[PDB]
Every structure is written in structure tokens, then in C-alpha cells.
């Protein structure tokens, strides 16, 4: 009945259970059977590039060799595919170390596969070393690079996450020396950096929380309902400025004719572009210092309380 | 690569399954890389003697 069968009905929707069984459809290779594959890959690649090298000039070749070269290329490609498939189990073994540290397990396996690929494009039989020994380093490289590059919503770069890991490991380890969680003094005494930089690093290592968490001992309110907006438009100000635009530009400006005209350009009230002295001295037929003089006259006359009394109340 | 909207792959009824006349489990196997399916076949090598 459903009680017994349900435990296996979902088995088809678990890539962790299914990939690890579809993976093992090829037996793991040994040392004797991989040098041949590597040599054949190298031969195929070199022949493939020699086709282009010769075609740069153009010549015709015997049919037998013409077909043998293509066979070599294809079968070296097959050798590469076989070698890639023969070590996905090692990839999984290495990847299963990093489970739970942000990245998804299957993503870690895929990145280990990328590391395996880059390893096979450098494994050299001529040195006599095993494929596993060389490829483990590259698998770790790829997996760790990915896990440090995209395991956070905010990307702390490789060089920064590096020092963050150094700080974390030192903080974890040094506790046993004194029985306390190290503070900036103790951390700085061994990180070879000053306390303020350590504080900056600790702040930089911060991670964002989710708004969807539910607070209030009930599943009704949310963390985010009570977020006050600091940017929200306030109607009164929207009104007030308009009134100022209808009080400053409209009334007080219309009291000195051309003498007030300089204020229109000097402060850019009519266009928004402030203008320098000479730039508005040459629109008329006067020098920059004449503009300065008329501006001083206007400032002295307008600054007087008799007119400033109306304009002051906005921010008195 | 292409992708299929989940709301139509399943839901009792599975709109995609009824549209293509495939059972939900058979359709599940195809979409999710578990079995092959024949898209088309040419009669020139089926009725050719």
C-alpha cells in the first residue's frame, strides 16, 4: 500500500541518489591503461592541428593516411571522454568534503568535474605520476575557487575571502591557548595586521538576512512590515518648495529688473546651470568684475531685513 | 537549454501530458533526463524494401 511504496515513489526525484548510481557505469582505470589514452589524445590533437598547419598552404595526401589521421583524432577524442568518465567517482569523493558550506552538493560535484577536466588537460604520463595524485590538486582548486566565489549573496573577492578565512581559522584555533574567544588585540597579535583593519574585515565578512522570516510568535506578521522608509516623499515639503518657487522666483526677483537679472543666471534658478562671473558678463557688454559689483549690490540690497523677513521663515 | 513550466508538467491534470498524450511518469522521465524519446521517423526507410 501507499505506506510501504511512498518511501520509494520519490526515489526518482532525488538527483543525489540517482547520479551516484548512473555515475558508476564504467570501471575505474589503472596506471597501465591511462598512459595509452593520454598518448592517443596527444596524437589526435597534434594531428588535428597539423591539418590546419598544412592547409595554410594546401596539399593533397594519400587516402589511407588521410583516413588514418581522422581515425586517430576521433579515437583520441574517445580516449579523452573515457578518461573523464573514469574519475567522476574520485570527483564525487573529493566534492563530498564541502557539503553544507553554502554551495549545493551537486553543484560542488559539477565544479569538481570542471576541475577534473582542467586536470586532464595537464596530466603528464611522462613524469610517471598517477592521474589521481595530480588531479586531486586541480579538483580542489576548482571546487574551492567556486565555493569562495559564489557562496555568498554579496561577492567578497578571492583575495578578501582568503584573509577572511585566515581570520576565521586563527580565531577558532587560538581559543585553546587561553580559553577565550580571541578579541581584536589577540587576533591582531598573530594576524600581522592592526586592530582597525581587523574590525573592517569582520564587518566585511557580514552576510544579509532574509525579510521573509516570521516574527511575533505567529505566522501573521513578518520581519519587514515595520521598515520605515527614509526616502519616502513627504507631501508638505513637496508643497513648501513650490510655495518657495512661487515666493522667491516670482515676487522677490521682480524688484530690480536687470540688476535682479544677474541672479537668474548667477544661481541658475531659471535653467539649473550655475554660471561664473565672466560667463554672464559677456552675455551683456560688461566685464566679470562689473558682474561681481552688481551682484554685490544685489546681495547688499536683498540681504537687508526689510525683504528677508518674508523669505526667512522657511528655515529661520 | 529549453525548460518547461512546472505548473503544466504536473498538477492532476498535467496539461502537457494530455496535450502530447504521454503518461505523467513517462513524461517525467523525458523532461528530466532519464529516458530517450523518438521525436520523428522517416518513412523512406520504414516502407522501403
Amino acid at each position: 500500500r501507499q505506506a510501504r511504496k511512498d518511501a520509494e515513489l520519490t526515489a526518482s526525484a532525488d538527483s543525489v541518489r540517482a547520479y551516484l548510481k548512473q555515475i558508476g557505469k564504467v570501471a575505474l582505470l589503472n596506471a597501465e591503461e591511462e598512459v595509452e589514452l593520454a598518448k592517443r589524445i596527444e596524437a589526435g590533437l597534434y594531428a588535428t592541428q597539423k591539418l590546419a598547419e598544412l592547409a595554410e598552404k594546401g596539399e593533397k595526401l594519400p587516402v589511407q593516411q588521410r583516413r588514418d589521421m581522422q581515425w586517430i583524432c576521433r579515437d583520441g577524442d574517445r580516449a579523452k571522454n573515457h578518461l573523464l568518465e573514469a574519475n567522476l567517482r574520485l570527483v564525487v569523493s573529493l566534492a563530498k568534503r564541502y557539503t553544507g558550506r553554502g554551495m549545493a552538493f551537486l553543484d560542488l560535484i559539477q565544479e569538481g568535474n570542471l576541475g577534473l577536466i582542467r586536470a586532464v588537460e595537464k596530466f603528464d604520463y611522462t613524469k610517471g605520476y598517477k592521474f589521481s595524485t595530480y588531479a586531486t590538486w586541480w579538483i580542489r582548486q576548482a571546487i574551492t575557487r567556486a565555493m569562495a566565489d559564489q557562496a555568498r549573496t554579496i561577492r567578497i573577492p578571492v583575495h578578501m575571502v582568503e584573509v577572511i578565512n585566515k581570520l576565521g581559522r586563527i580565531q577558532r584555533e587560538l581559543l585553546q591557548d587561553l580559553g577565550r574567544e580571541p578579541t581584536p588585540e589577540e587576533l591582531a597579535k598573530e594576524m600581522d595586521i592592526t586592530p582597525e583593519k581587523v574590525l573592517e574585515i569582520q564587518q566585511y565578512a557580514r552576510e544579509p538576512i532574509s525579510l521573509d522570516q516570521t516574527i511575533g510568535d505567529e505566522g501573521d506578521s513578518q520581519l519587514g512590515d515595520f521598515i520605515e522608509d527614509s526616502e519616502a516623499v513627504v507631501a508638505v515639503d513637496a508643497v513648501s518648495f513650490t510655495l518657495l518657487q512661487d515666493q522667491l522666483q516670482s515676487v522677490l526677483e521682480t524688484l530690480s529688473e536687470r540688476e535682479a537679472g544677474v541672479v537668474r543666471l548667477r544661481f541658475g534658478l531659471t535653467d539649473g546651470q550655475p554660471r561664473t562671473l565672466d560667463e554672464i558678463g559677456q552675455v551683456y557688454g560688461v566685464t566679470r568684475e562689473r558682474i561681481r559689483q552688481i551682484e554685490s549690490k544685489t546681495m547688499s540690497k536683498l540681504r537687508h531685513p526689510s525683504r528677508s523677513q518674508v523669505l526667512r521663515d522657511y528655515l529661520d | 537549454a529549453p525548460v518547461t513550466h512546472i505548473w503544466y508538467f504536473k498538477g492532476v491534470p498535467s496539461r502537457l501530458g494530455y496535450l502530447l498524450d504521454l503518461a505523467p511518469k513517462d513524461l517525467e522521465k523525458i523532461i528530466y533526463f532519464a529516458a530517450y524519446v523518438i521525436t520523428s521517423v522517416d518513412d523512406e526507410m520504414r516502407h522501403n524494401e
Partner: protein
């Protein structure tokens, strides 16, 4: 003005039309200077 509300099944072309840009990069905001990135999920 509102007379009725239609709910169709969006095709690929409609989805392309609805977007003024493509998200080609997975970062949200720069960890430093706190600004959106050039191709992230928050790009200006």
C-alpha cells in the same frame, strides 16, 4: 480605464519584450562602496 482583465500564457517573445536588459552575472551589490554592479541582479 478598466473594462476587463485578460490572463494569457506568455511566450518567449513577450518575455523578451518585457525586459530592457539581460542579467548576465550573479552578483547583487558590490561589497564595497555599496552600489549595484554593471550586470548584476540590481544593475542600474
Amino acid at each position: 480605464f478598466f473594462d476587463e482583465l485578460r490572463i494569457g500564457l506568455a511566450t518567449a517573445d513577450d518575455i523578451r519584450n518585457w525586459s530592457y536588459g539581460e542579467v548576465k552575472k550573479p552578483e547583487t551589490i558590490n561589497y564595497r562602496t555599496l552600489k549595484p554592479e554593471k550586470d548584476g541582479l540590481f544593475c542600474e
